[PDB]
DNA sequence: TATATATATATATATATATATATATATATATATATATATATATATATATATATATATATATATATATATATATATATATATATA
């Protein structure tokens, strides 16, 4: 396929596919039931490592989300299968980015030293089983 | 007229039992809307290429599979016309 496509062609696709995309979402519910426990695995392995750190290092209520933004982006980079040779660069990239959004670096050096215990989350939960 | 037995009305308060309204905040249970981002689950659109899966069009030839037309004759299969 190309790239360069007009504004009308994409709108024409999205408008005419409405019936098929909703009758495909109706089957994607059946598929989502068994695959949805990656949510449970994700928040288990993130809260089990961040609730003691945030809770005992002294950060407040509503800044915990900004720290979750940092940790969640790091876990996304992890479970797209990317090991330490890219992580040693994306750690200082994320450090500068969330310093730029108003955090304090006396928290950030300790937090970037802390996030090496977060790992990959998502697995597969549908086996083939031809029998 | 005064009592004992039950059905409802009032007179004026304070109680115990349940149905809903408010007064003003705080909380536990669920349905949705927002504020602002970063995630995990799926439906489609794009940005830009290279892949694997199938539907068709072309580029240029060569080949295996069948449907018909010709080129030039010779022959096996049947339908009819002539020659004598």
Brief descriptors of the model:
1 chains; 131 residues; 6 helices; 69% helix; 0% strand; DNA-binding; virus; filamentous virus; helical symmetry
* Cα distance spanning the termini: 38 Å
Q: Sketch the major β-sheet.
A: none
Number of helices, counting only DSSP H or I runs of 4 residues or more: 6
- Shape from CA axes? extended
Question: Strand portion, in percent?
Answer: under 5%
What is the assembly state of the chains in this entry? Answer: part of a larger assembly
SSE order = HHHHHH
Class inferred from helices and paired strands: mainly alpha
How many strands? 0
- The gyration radius over C-alpha positions equals 20 Å
Helix content: 55-70%
PDB class: virus
Keywords: filamentous virus, helical symmetry, membrane enveloped virus, virus
Entry title: Cryo-EM reconstruction of membrane-enveloped filamentous virus SFV1 (Sulfolobus filamentous virus 1)
Name: Fimbrial protein
Describe the SSE topology.
Blueprint: H1 7-16, H2 18-35, H3 38-57, H4 64-79, H5 84-100, H6 105-114
Helix pairs in contact: 4-5, 5-6
The chain binds one DNA strand of 84 nucleotides through helix 1, helix 2, helix 3 and helix 4.
């Amino acid at each position: 396929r190309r790239t360069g496509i007009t504004t009308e062609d994409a709108i024409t696709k999205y408008s005419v596919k409405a019936k098929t995309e909703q009758t495909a979402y109706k089957n994607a519910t059946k598929d989502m039931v068994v695959q949805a426990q990656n949510i449970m695995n994700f928040y288990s392995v993130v809260n089990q490592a961040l609730i003691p750190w945030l809770n005992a290092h002294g950060v407040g209520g509503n800044l915990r989300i900004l720290y979750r933004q940092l940790a969640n982006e790091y876990v996304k980079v992890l479970n797209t299968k990317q090991s330490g040779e890219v992580i040693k660069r994306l750690k200082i990239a994320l450090r500068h980015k969330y310093w730029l959004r108003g955090l304090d670096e006396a928290m950030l050096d300790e937090f970037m030293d802390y996030i090496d215990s977060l790992k990959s989350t998502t697995t597969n939960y549908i086996i083939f089983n031809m029998q």
